[PDB]
Design a protein around this ligand. Structure first.
Ligand SMILES: CC(C)CN(C[C@@H](O)[C@H](Cc1ccccc1)NC(=O)O[C@H]1CCOC1)S(=O)(=O)c1ccc(N)cc1
Ligand SMILES: [Cl-]
Ligand SMILES: [Cl-]
Ligand SMILES: [Cl-]
Ligand code: NA
Lengths: 99, 99
């Protein structure tokens, strides 16, 4: 698609066999989702946002579909206002900003 | 142009006579710039996200040259860790996310 920005760029994602809503966020280095069960081991990560830095859980090589596009990569889990698809997975699905 | 997302999508902006570097951020509803003076009236606002909320000043009807493209709209000013061009001004320069 070509997505304009008059409203929030919200899409459906599928993770763990469940559909969720997520924000496509070019200002997010990383993908972070609200608390849920993911398989495997996790590692600690510090991420920075508007209010400061927080520690979150990092899961690697997670299968995730984004607006129908398949990705496999790093998903963080932690306190987040919305599920966020950031540049690590935006790049995998071939997203660019154009003007 | 067409901007990939392998690295942060940073551009040069001009605002209030000053050149700054800013992130083109599809996840940000409104544009937020680090502390600077702007002309006219303002009102206080709180904005939040990862790491919580910050208090900002909301200035309306501010012109900003973004990578060569002029746009007018609301500009928030406050202790953001990064200058962010949000959707309110991305729309005006015809920015889209494509994949
Ligand atoms: C969290 C989203 C929903 C909203 N933010 C936008 C995001 O793009 C935000 C931008 C940013 C980059 C680096 C440092 C600080 C902020 N990135 C962000 O948190 O990246 C984290 C999430 C995973 O990767 C790392 S916001 O800054 O809170 C915000 C809120 C309101 C307005 N008007 C403007 C900005
Ligand atoms: Cl990744
Ligand atoms: Cl505006
Ligand atoms: Cl349009
Ligand atoms: Na004004």
């Amino acid at each position: 698609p070509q997505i304009t920005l008059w409203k929030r760029p919200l899409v459906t994602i599928k993770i763990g066999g469940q559909l969720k809503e997520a924000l496509l966020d070019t200002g997010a280095d990383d993908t972070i989702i609200e608390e849920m069960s993911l398989p495997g081991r996790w590692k600690p990560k510090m991420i920075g946002g508007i209010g400061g830095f927080i520690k979150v859980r990092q899961y690697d090589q997670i299968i995730i579909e984004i607006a129908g596009h398949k990705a496999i990569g790093t998903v963080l889990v932690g306190p987040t206002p919305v599920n966020i698809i950031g540049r690590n997975l935006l790049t995998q699905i071939g997203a660019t900003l154009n003007f």
